[PDB]
DNA sequence: CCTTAAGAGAGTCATAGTTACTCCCGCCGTTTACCCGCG
DNA sequence: GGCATTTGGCTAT
RNA sequence: GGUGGACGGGCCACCCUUAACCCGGAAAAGGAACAUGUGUUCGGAAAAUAGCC
DNA sequence: CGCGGGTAAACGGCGGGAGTAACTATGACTCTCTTAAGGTAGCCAAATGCC
């Protein structure tokens, strides 16, 4: 098993090779060095406490107190895990926390009264057999002449008065005939068809279009359209379809560019495999690295459907081409009438450009082989696109030559065994990008035209999952707290987009009110769509999409939401929801995943009835295998869970959730016992960091991948689950240790360096303990100020003002700064007010609500870093500097060793003698190859004579570089010209530049960053140094003007702006000045690294080569 | 060719907050089970 | 005319 | 003590042919699958609606 | 049989005091410190929208 090394041990011997390598830290290093892959653990010898990390046990030993393992003896023992407690309440608490199901069963048992004694001592000597016989006889003797006869005497030893008594127990006047149970048919939502004629005026949009086009023709307006086609359309042309098809074909042929041809630019040794892997990863790093992040983090390269193409063709022919019966939704109504005014204002090129800018730039093309890039290249002003889309909109036609689309299969499950079956493959359908853009524009217009029920949080402007998750959690929490019964059900529509019949969407776009013109446009957009599916290298014959909505067309989400809206509206109208105060919420929704809420079990029965009726009518099917639910009946002291019977969705037992069980919801793990199951963030984080560690992903690339691709995945779950600061801090320690291992930074490296952003000089590593609270506060503010009055009321009533205040304080905000959660939130539009008011609302970029941040925690990290006397000296120089910190983010030309050494230098944690002896009193910190008292980076790079040569070399090289720049800008250069002042001294200026008349005297110095004035003082020194050479300089060059600005350069890469003034005096343009400044910074840092390497070799390597 | 100084985080255990309940006490209100008048 | 302005990820479905 | 295991720290194998390896500041196919020893591939594969950082 | 009206005691439903297991959050302290090579060139971070 896992080998164990026990401490305290001054010089433990490794369990695998038995080498006395040193202290337990050195032993751990050696174990990771020569014994990787083999598990080791460290143990507390006096206490048998195990931990993989040696330092944990090392710090524990002093705190340890003998043999600390005695169990907490107590006469109340837990049945399952056998823990002992000294009080019944304590044992019940343990069973509650650890065994939620057992505690729930105990709660229900306590609730079940079962005293068999709730009478009141008034029970008599009546016999059950006599009771039953009297029951039968009076059923026989119902107020019919001679009504006692038998009753009086047949019951021997009784009186008719006793008969009256027992009847008064059961039946009062008579006996008790037992007849109970509720009625089944209580929905009645399948009648009263309403469709009579066109919802809106049949020419409601056609009349407006004719008026607008007449105005455009008369006044020669800017509305664009082919004259002949709209002229024929006005004239009632019979063959408008062919003519518009021809005009389309022409414009598309203009768009159907000859798209640029691809311009993308023993003997058995396993070395090849390794090389290949490295090559692959590095290539994916150089090219798109979202795929690299997916491959590494997820571990799945890419999953393709191995199912035979014949089977796929058969299934999708029987699915897409096969129709289903439709009859209308009956009483199911959808919110309210549709607003046709949204379809006024014909499409303008500005609107098309706005929509394109909001699309995905890198979208794969359809069968047209036309991408967004090509669309913009052909029509950068979108005038041709405006003409085409206006023609289609006015004529209500969409050419069939563009309907052709290509399909594909996507793995919707991560388990390859599940992927074996075809049911776990999602069919995507990608049409011509022109069609995608037109459908997106019509989708925006429709979304404004048809208002969806507010409870539908999917595919709308509100933040969806955040609102639904918070509302569900708060609903359950309030039900637990206020002793109100709650019943929750989670329902998913099967084949949401592939099972929605075109006739159903048409019906929804009927009496809703949508203009018949737009209804015709929609029907056309899903008429004669051919989607020949392609798998691997083989493509199926054409398949005619006659059922469902293309999974990938921009209008499909909106059409599905419109199709579902009657269901959500009916559920809301049923008023069976959770009675949250005066109002009551009935169903949260997100696309197809909808959760129904109720106040009683029978209320959820009614909701299930409504859902079943809707699924029967619309044709959508709800599978009971992915539907969950639970009930929260309350007790005196607490709540029971699932005390009632299971639900009967579609005549099948709904999968109820027991305490401790967790069924996922919007990526969460809703658990009836504790709301959301606490996510496994430590486990996922450890897995991801291990995957990154063991990849051909050189430390800098590892850090880039971590920062840019790993953290967000955990960010979502960490923020949406209330995640406390302690767990986030533990995750932060894990990430910090792993990152330091990647970059070989010593464990004691300042946290500020790790957490300050790359632009600020740090590594740009996210601090979860300081970011997740900020995101949480912002999310609470967003939910508080949501557009849904229901969500507002629900959340406000749960006193989330205090929660938001606590999160604001926790994130680092100030009590005073706390915004009033009810105050309006500033909205920005990324355009000037004049420009905004210059255009209509269809061309207006979507407004973005700006929510305040509790504090710039990165600024706090930088402030902490500066306060450190040793690991933050002179680090204010790199603050908010975009030049000196460029290399941290663009380090091509830095060898990985060079980049890591630069990180160490910048963080002031380079292992020098001063750093090695830092803190300890009994550890020499003198200079190893010199007599300086302290072996710091400043001395090593600026004072030690040992590296004198290297230092000179660095200076000289930098001078040469500047000279080269001056040569490029056509300046005559004099290098190190001897000059003796009036005092007959030796003053050499590094560079003398001559052009036209004026001459420039530039001296280059490289100074370590310690204090702000340092560079200023260097420049002054040079200014205070040459001066007196004025006359001499003239005689050397004949110049008429001379200047004496110096050229200081940061030893660690700082670029003072006085150097920018030097360059401006040189006449360099601003952008080239920025390029030169970045190049300098990087090259100065590289030469300082060279000096450090020369120092390291001096002495050490001298002794090694020469003992 | 240029500088003075020199912990800092990792880590555990102790103790207090606090979450979401559990236990018990006791009182007031509801239920149960006959009684009486009774046409 | 450069200038300037911006380039990235993730989650849900 | 010398070589081999791409290179370095090990650790192994041979005494030149080379079975397996761990870690790395090193590592851009002597692999896998086609095409008959020599070429290719060894996909950037994947769409949409919203939100969040 | 049906018709009401009275009935009054466990017990259960609830207000509230008293605990409490086990997280969660700081506070008070201690422990940690030599991983592994040598050279050379030092570059890639640009592309793109508007102007
Ligand atoms: C996951 C996903 C969903 N969607 C859309 C299309 C779906 O119809 C809709 C809901 O998705 P799902 O409900 O996750 O898919 P489904 O219900 O059709 O699968 P199943 O029958 O097994 O339950 O969201 C996408 O467009 N792209 C995606 O990647
Ligand atoms: Mg579904
Ligand atoms: Zn060992
Ligand atoms: Zn111990
Ligand atoms: Zn237990
Ligand atoms: Zn020295």
Residue numbers in the entry: 1 to 265, 280 to 1121
Excerpt from the publication:
For comparison to the avian R2s used in PRINT, we identified R2s outside of Aves but within the Reptilia phylogenetic group that gave rise to Aves. We chose R2p from the big-headed turtle Platysternon megacephalum (PlaMe) for additional study based on its robust biochemical activities as purified recombinant protein (described below). We therefore assembled TPRT complexes with PlaMe and TaGu proteins with either Gf-full or Gf-98 RNA. Within Gf-full or Gf-98, only the RNA 3′-terminal 65 nt before the base-paired RNA-primer duplex is visible in our cryo-EM density maps. In addition to the provided primer-template duplex, an added ddTTP was also resolved. ZnF3 domain from PlaMe contacts the pseudoknot of 3′UTR RNA. (D) Side chains in PlaMe ZnF3 make base-specific hydrogen bonds with G-236. PlaMe ZnF3 also makes a contact with the phosphate backbone of base G-237 at the junction of hinge and pseudoknot. A major difference between the PlaMe and TaGu proteins, in comparison to each other, is the disposition of the Spacer, the region that connects the N-terminal DNA binding domains to the NTE motifs. TaGu has a Spacer of ~80 amino acids that could not be resolved in our cryo-EM map, whereas PlaMe has a Spacer of only ~30 amino acids that we partially observe in our structure in contact with the RT core. While the entire PlaMe CTI could be mapped in the cryo-EM density, the density for the part of the TaGu CTI away from the RT domain and the active site RNA:DNA duplex is only visible in our unsharpened cryo-EM map displayed with a low density threshold.
